[model samples]
Target chain A: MAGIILTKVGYYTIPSMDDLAKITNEKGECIVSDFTIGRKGYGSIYFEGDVNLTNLNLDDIVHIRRKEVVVYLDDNQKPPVGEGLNRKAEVTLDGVWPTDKTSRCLIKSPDRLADINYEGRLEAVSRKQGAQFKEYRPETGSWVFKVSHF
Target chain B: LWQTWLPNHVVFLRLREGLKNLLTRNVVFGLGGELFLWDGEDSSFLVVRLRGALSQYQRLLCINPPLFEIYQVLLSPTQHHVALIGIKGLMVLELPKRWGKNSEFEGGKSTVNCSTTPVAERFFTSSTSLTLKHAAWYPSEILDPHVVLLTSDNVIRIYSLREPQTPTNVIILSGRAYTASLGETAVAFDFGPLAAVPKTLFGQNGKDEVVAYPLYILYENGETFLTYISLLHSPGNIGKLLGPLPMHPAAEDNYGYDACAVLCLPCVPNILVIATESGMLYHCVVLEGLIPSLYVFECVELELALFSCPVKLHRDPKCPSRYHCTHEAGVHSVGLTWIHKLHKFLGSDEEDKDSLQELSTEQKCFVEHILCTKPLRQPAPIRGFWIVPDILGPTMICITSTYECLIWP
Candidate 1:
């Protein structure tokens, strides 16, 4: 069936500019734990296709690939953008999908504000530093803010 | 100085006090939207030829930054300053006769560009969602001009006319519509000529929690508290006496709070009448046994009343309210209930569209808040209602889903 879809949408816990600069030039990829909308997961993540990346060294570029963002009903059927009872999931490089122009990559740190120059196009990623967009799973007094893209 | 998206470039003109009596002395020059000024009779009346009230403002744009469409309008406490807010941060100016594009005060060397969808172009979007939706302002003084603005992401930016255009970043009310919705879908109606009471006791200093669309009373303790409530069936029916003032989440099943709107009452106390969108007038009064002077220590309580009768045809079923379904284009119903008390109307369990269950228990509880718990009689349409409360800055209030709330000067 449609590859086991994720219930929680994917998000990145961005590090500081200083942290990113150091990590990109030296460290490999930052492994962050995202717990958005009550679901929890961990992923080795990076940027995506037609990428216009900046403030980094290509040598440390982790991975790059492209994938379609499909929303399925009850994690079964397909969904259109801006329609239906929407459910969100992430499109990451770790997934085993036949790829094309769409791509992905790992970064040292996330910039709160950036113009991704990795792929051909420059997507303005409001890469907020630190963790946010969290939901309080009253079940767990701790805040769950990040949604990791599978 | 709250205003609409009038055409740009046309310089607004002003007529001196004595001259205003002669010919039509125009203050704002924005093309046809809504402009409020007083006639010689000193009566606070509108100059519209249309039927129904607040219809002029309803004609403004509606482009919810989070939703597909939303619009923002800010009205001043005294109905002087008005501004239209947008995601791209196109904070426009609606000056009275005094501010004719001549006021050159900017926050800093930073020149803020007026824009919409193209927000991505200017503001380096923060990693988190970012967009300014609705706002309210603190009344101005010789030094501090009070104002508050709201973001779809649940942020309140405090501002002053003499200070930077950007909010001073006082507090952030998290857990608002994250992505799907914001204050973009708010609706309500006016109650009647209520009273206002202001107490000098300061509000409690606590983390700001935007529990619901706040039925606000700017407390004397520098604290602005919002109550979660609904007005459906309140005061009886939508067409009845000073009908219920509905906040958005009021119709949702999980809403918390009751139908009554209370704060400090009586102008005799410290609270005064403060106006808001939705035509709901508020007057605040400080509770008895409190000193009028500021900074005094005592238990602070308030009794707030809603006044001014404006019929708002909201689509929120749970709220005891009504608005004539306008056949005109671009009109959509809105709900303005408190935020935290939202119904699980569109919760996660609905992944199974085919086998989707009805709203959960919490959702139903939310809806109950808007019901008319008590019978309320219908009132004659009011010429206008006014309530004076002591507060500053603007927070987004509900209106028709199309035209959102913003801050005025």
Candidate 2:
């Protein structure tokens, strides 16, 4: 079965269950899930099933079909573990996509994905916080962003 | 048509006035602490250094400074004298007839040697404790040019370049005699002829008679006043105050918008253009008869859509009744043809029912022309600008805050 893993730091769009089935065989199960590793206000979306993830170009994958989407974090419900955890991980659950109709995602470990070749290590700290994505190049696997604030 | 990065940040820019021909239209600018004269035709520049030899004696312990930070450059009407007003003091240089000898070299570039000498220079010390705000060449005195200076202490001093030691005439604005109120200081001033007496009224011989020009002074508190000054009568004696000119109704919000520049058109008499800090331009007509009055005909914004600060007004010597307002955003050219229409309508004997409505329609068109027209915008906020008059057309030069000088066709 083919699958597509979208990182939170990049632009992406959610494909409908019918469109995912059309890209692959209808026999396999189609599932869409969002998860977070350790970063705050960041997460990833996994589109797995019988889908041709390689056939979908960067433009098609990043094109946001829906104006509004619900984002869920994995560890948002879990309680703090130590007294030094003064600040809770912020979760942006409900919001509209960017002006260019693209949703941003972050990949904690890009090395695990063998289907897509990443330019370099994708780290949450390296990605500027609260910055708008200006342009995304699929060939170079680079995302250009505007100035970011702390 | 030309753009380049200046050697240093330019604080002031001015075109050399009274050029003999268009080919010799040279430009001067103050970059850092030095003054550079640029030959527009050859694209060569000369760094003219001012030796403050005269100010050396006036300084404490007679120590000579390296360079004075230039604030403004004032060119005389004849272009023979150049006055450099700096933070240290005032330096008046008698410019050489031939600025420099240009020599063509390799790589399509030329070099020029500078001729630097000063006729008079003075340092601000002891008696001159106040800072200089603005200075202009007295247009009436063509042969012996007198420099009229407005200082921070609310005093207008008239000094001849020959004797920089003392001011011949000083008009202090501390009292209510000079300004509208007691504490109002003079911010800007311009010189223009009085409109009360028509030039044609006098015969051909009477044209040579000395006309008492009015000095339009803009106060810091947004009040404008005019006093008569001529070659025969001194400013102190010929003290016939015209205003405290009335302001436009729209500017009464008390947002603390002060008057920045005042321009009295020499070609179009009685039409006074005043620019405020909030980008409003007040076009006033001076009615100077038995009862002198100032009437503001129209108030127009520099940038209709955006907020801007109109810093200076430059009159087009080639085109009469036309001027350019240089603001933070861009430069706006304004034509005063509507003033002629207003005068014609007022003087006409027509009492037709549609005459007043027609005049109003014409006035509306004039205002729309100024507001709807787009200006030559700059990449950054303009620090200074100058219009170089050419035979073909006038060239606009703007120095932005990004240290880039842009010259437009």
Candidate 3:
């Protein structure tokens, strides 16, 4: 299945193997659509395909559609994943903030080149950050949920 | 495979105290590789060199040294200095050079080093009583030299190192505390250097600059809010409250769960962790311009009930790094990041996968099952926790309540 690149606070998600094959080639240049690039997330890429991402030119994202992109992966090469508010985005880098207030991504991948099918939107947003600290959950009433063990 | 390293060395401190007095925040690391442990009730403290074995650590530095009911003992990273807040007032001492060997330990009964001279000392007057609740020194980076103290009356007094007797300035906490009727309202406080401050934080000139070391006060004033006071200019000159905190998101009636401890992650100034009486840990994100907001991040679910345990859980005195800090209790080890999610600490689908792949599928499943379970058990309760840094950072030191000291590189 073709995957859409979803954007979140600190990262961009490359959901499937199909998206990986379209944006990159043996030489690692944009296979060509209308892609722009940012510097912060330029360090690495996380592709799920058996194809070796290490060979792809991940430094610059090609315009697979109409979005600007830079892919960043954690030290372990795991795909950026999230749960609640910033789910599916990369974990914000510690001791370092993005130089710019906002980050942009191409939501869809550019299909068979010359045919020209722009599947994604060109979107940009101010990155949202978690509170430096958080407090407890207040219970309006005393309710206890039971647990079972094997 | 990124992994959580277990403590390499466990040095047990042989001290037996009552539940009421467990030396709340007395463990500190000094400038020249020394550890100072304090006991509040009897006003007895110890200083040990960060050397030797788990069994030989007892043969460490001076024992029962700072025999004073110290509100706090502060350490400086750059200079060989220490500060203490006693019932009498404040005192700063220059740490003595480590002797080739602690000859005092030769005897079963060692005399607490009572002869070391103090660099500066101040005695409070009985007539003018200052009920100092908490005290801390400025981070070593500032070098400008200052100390902060909180009085029972909620007055924050800043004293310069030059003039120990007089306070350069004072901040008064003015507001009604919003509390839960079910429990008492408790205040949590700490001070240290910050990486970033919202441009508009502290209501100062919104100039974007690193918000260096600032004192923080987290308490329940109708709701929980963090108040930061940045020591801007000279002692008497530059200091202001960033502003009142926004209301905590919780049932208004249930907001009274007291703050047992308030601490910030080392180096990463923006993140603060507040532990509540109900075994809940809140990891808050505080920005400079935007208002601070918090969420229930960890359910530390202690094996023991809230009332049965001691007053508060002590945080590691040193900054947390991948190798050295434990985010939860009973782990006897360290976690990978500064903050932890409710689940999946390590060796999982999204984390440290390479490490787990080495294990058999059955081994992997067993690890996952253990991770899913609540409160991984430990041999004893944790009394105090701290880290010892080498030339490089990201080190770990875990100490159990039963005096087990574990170190990891």
Candidate 4:
């Protein structure tokens, strides 16, 4: 699937993260977007859409994530338009992805780059004792953390 | 619950001075260098700058100037004046009236108006001063602005705002026999009704009667002395000394149980309320025979044990029996039912029906809850709190150390 990637462009005040979610929900589309603020006080947004997504005036487009595998890019390295980027995006995982139960993924992007592709298999894990994972269900406006204990 | 954040943090000062405004529904207090007026009806906040005279005083006294801070802010009973007492000075502001015109103009001629703007004209900024302990407006029927100030040097100076330069009357207590041996300074003082004694006992002729008001002074070492002062007569003349409030034998040995606040029940004669630093409250009575004396009849400890430093006692003028004991931790509401029982004990047939009558269901619930349970604690240490009278119901305004002003049902 071909999608557009948005990154904060210039110096301007943005709405709070909760307000950004409300604004995204008001657009009346099935656009999956996430916004995060950095420790040094800059904001970034990620969404799934086409080139028309740029009309929302969200941010400048650095690159697009279009393949099954995730690709990492450097600040100065802008890949060429066709073949070189295709080879970098075509790498796939070998293990079977779990689909029987929904799970949360904890993503930490210290360098302000985080992307999860469709074929990515991830499970929420915590090494500390009595740790729990909660998943947000926006449709119901609630979280489902645990229902049973063995 | 409704909460508003203040622009400046509130400093802990006199509890009775800044929190209570009996005349209006708005809450007025001094925070940092500004006076805040929180309108309860509209939920709006207004700040009046208080540094105009303070900064000028600093410029005038440039040699080792002391840091100026507002020690107390008191609203007059008539709501026409606000007395802002600083560390070394005093400033009285004439509050502007709501909905009053600024000036009247007729054919290019304008005249000065009434309450057009708040005028901070009546002030006394001292260069070298004795530390002021506490100050209050003299309770008077007319709108005469008389401020009574107690200094650390054991003197009470009554300053009429008309003559702001010097006090109109000064009463010295340093050389008195009651205050001499204790070697303790005065911490707090309050005014109550004069002991209901015959006027002829003071050698007053029927033609010229002498009227005096009882002044209760609390000392640092758990001693409370009662004296009489005639505000109408030679105001400086101190009448007979009444008491050094008698305490229990156990309380005398307790080193931490020093009296910090004293309040006289003006509605019921001869009834006094005193709170100690160790959260012990003494319900005392002033008795008169050949001489005047006070005895502690009832004593109770506050429920909130952790925050036991009782700073001030506030009584609602509308509901005299319903009073609030404000501690460093929080405020506790208490009903003065003991007065009625005391009246019964003294063989009086008349009952105080005012406090029990016309109480709404909400008011009844509030009265019952305060009577039964412990006082609700605040998240932060409370700087000051007041019970504001409203049409719907009485609400409490609490200012905490975290710079949050809270109003609750």
Candidate 5:
């Protein structure tokens, strides 16, 4: 009954930096990341590639492979050439969900002064560190913050 | 001959303020996921976005001197504007936006950067030498978009954002009454569900189309009390005072002393929770019938002193089915079964012996004192607190002096 479906959705927790560096499907295949909600102690998970929500449970363990992060160094500072900056990313979640839309959760509001990394691709990652988009776009490709973060 | 603590009590979730390394700066959390780190002492500020597990590599949007010392920074609900309180006066600054380049295809720092115009202006200024103690945006229910500044003196000035040249209305709490040093005052409007409000409360045809938003203020003189004000006009024309909250042995006595933070729960607007510096959390409910009266439903005794303000997060939309709605008037306890692992070891003499042998005599005695002594009724040193409802359980982020604890369902 299971076939190659265009829609795949999965809800799983990456737990730590290692699991995130090498996330895998039930079949053990690495995929591009979508979003992460929280970090370390308490967080939630999300997947959006043909995975069915029915197969997921509240306590199900999931796998993920960390994607390359594009770090934006200061204007005067740039990474040297010919070296692998293969840093593994760790993701945490507060809940588990597989949805057609982006799945996210905000445990607690971040302090207005929390740090945000603009180099991070996902706003969820930025928010976890205390950085927020200036004008948050619910449905997003790229979002900006009201005030710029260092 | 005398009892020390309050009778009824519960341990609230621990709420830590900012990072432990930093102190004295004002910390404001935005509903939108961002941190507004400002140091009023240095007149400098930084905005950071989260990335990764730790804050080491987080991006810094802009780090600049705000020109003047920033006493406190309050973010607007929508996050578009920020109200800054300083030594000079209160100023409202619109956030800057980058122009020119787009991030759709071109991404990262390589994108040609453009400096957005930062509009900073002094919205309100006072002739008094006394500094502004506290200021907050008036509740939407109140007059037009405006801000209320509480000075070190007993004067409360309401300034409209539309016209900041002067205060539209003012209220003097007392000519010579004692006020708390930390600006122990809070303001809120009664915008509870329409069905909950009596039809007669507003009166016929809205009474010449006049809108009156009930305002409540809690402050400390020698003792703490609630003062209710009803306004006939939004911008000015200050209305009648419903009178200061009736005194009570529980709230007026030595227990519920020195009101600090005032929190109005969204679950019920009439029920006002006043947190005191003396570890008493009091609930005062206002019943609006033909004859309105304010009543203290209960007083919750806590162990630690509360100085910081209290806040509540709106319930998550997806967790409606899983979440149990919070109540307005109730004494919910940190269940006996919910004791932390550290607390467990302290209470039981039956130790593993393995870890017990590692403890010094003083350590053993400290543990015994913690366990054998009277139970800790409240979370000690609660710096800040906020609620979060998720599918797993409704959790509260309580920050204490030592660490951040997640009090959950």
Candidate 6:
């Protein structure tokens, strides 16, 4: 499985993870894609085609940004694992939009890389981002939606 | 992703008293100066070319030439005869028996012109420029009703229509002028007697330039009511700012970016839209206490945009012009660049992956460890979800131009 990217559209201009982090000026900006920004439907290389948010902990957010991403774990991982959209893509010394600023995996040992690869692919791929803004989906909260819960 | 924006349109039509006719069927609008008349079952729209310059909306029933035109048109309490205020400022039309029941401009074999309307007598005349801005029946059934006119001298002068022809001067709002003075029509909601009034009176910016907008505020502080409001909230309050409105820029007068809005009050309800030259719109709650929803559609280029709510919906869609002002475009065009399939707002997806050189690599590694580069077996955090809920909070509103009419909690 390979890391994937999703596209979204709405009536108002909703920025991309890269641009969102830039303008928010929160923990400040990132030049590249070192961090991730999450929305409703997103996953990683390991999940491949088998991703689901049912295991997410709607309570825990991985980071805090004024106007961009907030990462968290999904119920699919039960204990909730993964840095989301809040992942910042920092700008390098040579000014430019940063897309792969903190992909985290370029320096791994072949064996270490293979171990993680057994979970997916094997290559010099940039690592994934790890952060997000604290967002709530009241529409999906069990207690709020629980008409007659256990 | 790469995306595109939207624009607007405005039209007018005419409607007759008892007939059924409309301007157009498919909404292929943009027609000007036409008023539309609609019956429960049908409608009619007419372009009124009266003789001379009357109130912006009252020229439909007048005749023309040098000394021609009706300055004002007032209906009796019974809606029987129409009191036509003329170029010479005279109340002249008397109704026939067939009126009130239904005004039959029924194509009389003889085509009627301005001066042809039947009249009984002449009323009092004034040397002043009696620019009648608006005229409406005082809701309370009172005798010696007064006709309010916004004069060229910028004074609101009222005349009592005592004997159809002659009138007694009633009240004159001369303490302080209003911000947006009346032009063609001024809508007034009664607030009881002249002396006894409420705390707040309702009104808004009418057509006027920024610095020139006179604030007409009538406040009650016992016997002496004070009216104070100098509405210079930037030029676009009455009309538009002349061109493109990008947040707040210092330049003024005839150039740079302008802001315009589409106004809609309780009386008219269509797709209610309001806009600002700063590329923002609001869906204010006319119903009161609805958390007033609003959306801000901005270009995302410079400045920090603030989200305020006081929705304006109007008959005109401020068009695209560069003399420097600006729309009230559409609510759905703000979609991402990928929305092209639905012919929707789309964003750019072609820009190359940006460089991460600006951030500290060590910091990047720290974040990396927390994600996939950790010690022995630290699993990475989720990818699509925002991570702030565990720390701070979420946004309370979403602002923009088209979607300014509504917002999510």
Candidate No. with top TM-score: 2
Indicate which candidate wins on DockQ: 1
User: Which CAPRI quality tier does the interface of model 6 achieve?
Assistant: incorrect
**If ranked by lDDT, best first, what sequence of candidates would result?**
2, 4, 3, 5, 1, 6
Note the Cα lDDT for every prediction shown: 0.25, 0.45, 0.38, 0.44, 0.34, 0.23
Q: Model 1: residues >4 Å from true position, as ranges?
A: A1-150, B1-70, B78-80, B90-129, B139-144, B175-409
Name the top lDDT candidate: 2
Going through the candidates in order, what is chain B's TM-score? 0.30, 0.66, 0.59, 0.66, 0.54, 0.28
CA shift of B245, model 3, Å: 1.8
Regions of model 4 farther than 4 Å from truth: A1-150, B1-67, B100-129, B175-183, B194-204, B207-211, B247-257, B303-310, B344-380
Local lDDT at B156 for model 3? 64
Model 3 lDDT per residue over B277-338, tens place: 44444444343333444332222333332122223433444435221112233332223243
lDDT of 2 at B129: 51
C-alpha DockQ of every model? 0.03, 0.01, 0.01, 0.00, 0.01, 0.01
Candidate 5 residue B373 Cα shift, in angstroms, is 21
Worst 10 residues of 1 chain A by lDDT: A96-105
List the candidates' TM-scores in order: 0.28, 0.51, 0.47, 0.50, 0.43, 0.23
Q: What TM-score does candidate 5 get on C-alpha atoms?
A: 0.43
Give the per-residue lDDT of model 4 (tens digit) for A1-150. 122223443322123433444444344432333222121221112221221221232233222121111222332443343312211111111221211111112222312111232111111221111213233222221212221111
Candidate 4 lDDT, B1-409, residue by residue in tens: 1223322333212222344530111135533344544322222223433332211101011112123444445777565666655545555656432332421112112121222111112233332445666777877646477888877677778877777656777766651110111225677788886434345545454654455667788876556677665555543545455545443222222223246777887754466777776777766655543444454454667743334444577776556566776655456666765454444233111132222222211232122223111235533345445565545576666665433455554
Docking quality tier of model 4: incorrect
lDDT of 2 at B250: 24
The ten-residue window of minimal lDDT in model 4 chain B covers B54-63
- Each model's fnat? 0.00, 0.00, 0.00, 0.00, 0.00, 0.00
Error of 6 at B285 (Å): 6.8
| Tens digits of per-residue lDDT for model 6, B27-124 | 11111212211111121112222211112221223342224344233445554334444433434333322122223233321222333232212222
